[PDB]
Amino acid sequence: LHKEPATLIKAIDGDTCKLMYKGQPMTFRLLLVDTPETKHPKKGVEKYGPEASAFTKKMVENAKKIEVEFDKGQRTDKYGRGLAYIYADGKMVNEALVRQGLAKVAYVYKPNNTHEQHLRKSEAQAKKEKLNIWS
């Protein structure tokens, strides 16, 4: 996979944000993870949702560099959202959320699952440590 620069426009929630990619605005959605809901009514404001949002917001807004890494399959979902692994100062946001027990590994559609195993290892560690979602 290859990383590419991007610029933060606005963090929306734990796993969705607006970035400037190729001088164009885009909403992106993290690959292989699912942070709890804070918006959609027919889902409600789930526990750890506000937490996942703040963890993410803090991480991306205080970063000097943000990079996007698309996987080997399709790059956008049905809603026109960019699908990627996002790094804040070299730290993958997707993994960080999972490691903290603030997101579960979800939506694994091959071939967009190159980092699936790394992430699952991180989730297993958070489970055994009984972190947040796992407590």
- Binding residue ranges for Ca(2+): 15, 34-35
Size of the site for ligand THP (CB under 6 A): 10
Stretch near Ca ion under the rule CB under 5 A, chosen from 30-38, 53-61, 82-90, 93-101: 30-38
Residue type, 69: E
Q: Which helix (H) or strand (E) holds 79?
A: none
Q: Name residue 111's beta-bridge partners.
A: none
| 29 binds ligand THP, rule: CB under 6 A | yes
Nearer to Ca ion, 107 or 134 (CB): 107
User: d(Cα 120, Cα 132) in Å, to the nearest integer?
Assistant: 16
Nearer to ligand THP, 65 or 92 (CB): 92
Q: Which residues are catalytic?
A: 29, 37, 81
Neighbours of 46 (CB within 10 A): 14
Stretch near ligand THP under the rule CB under 6 A, chosen from 4-12, 62-70, 104-112, 126-134: 104-112
User: Hey, what are 10's tokens?
Assistant: 């606005």
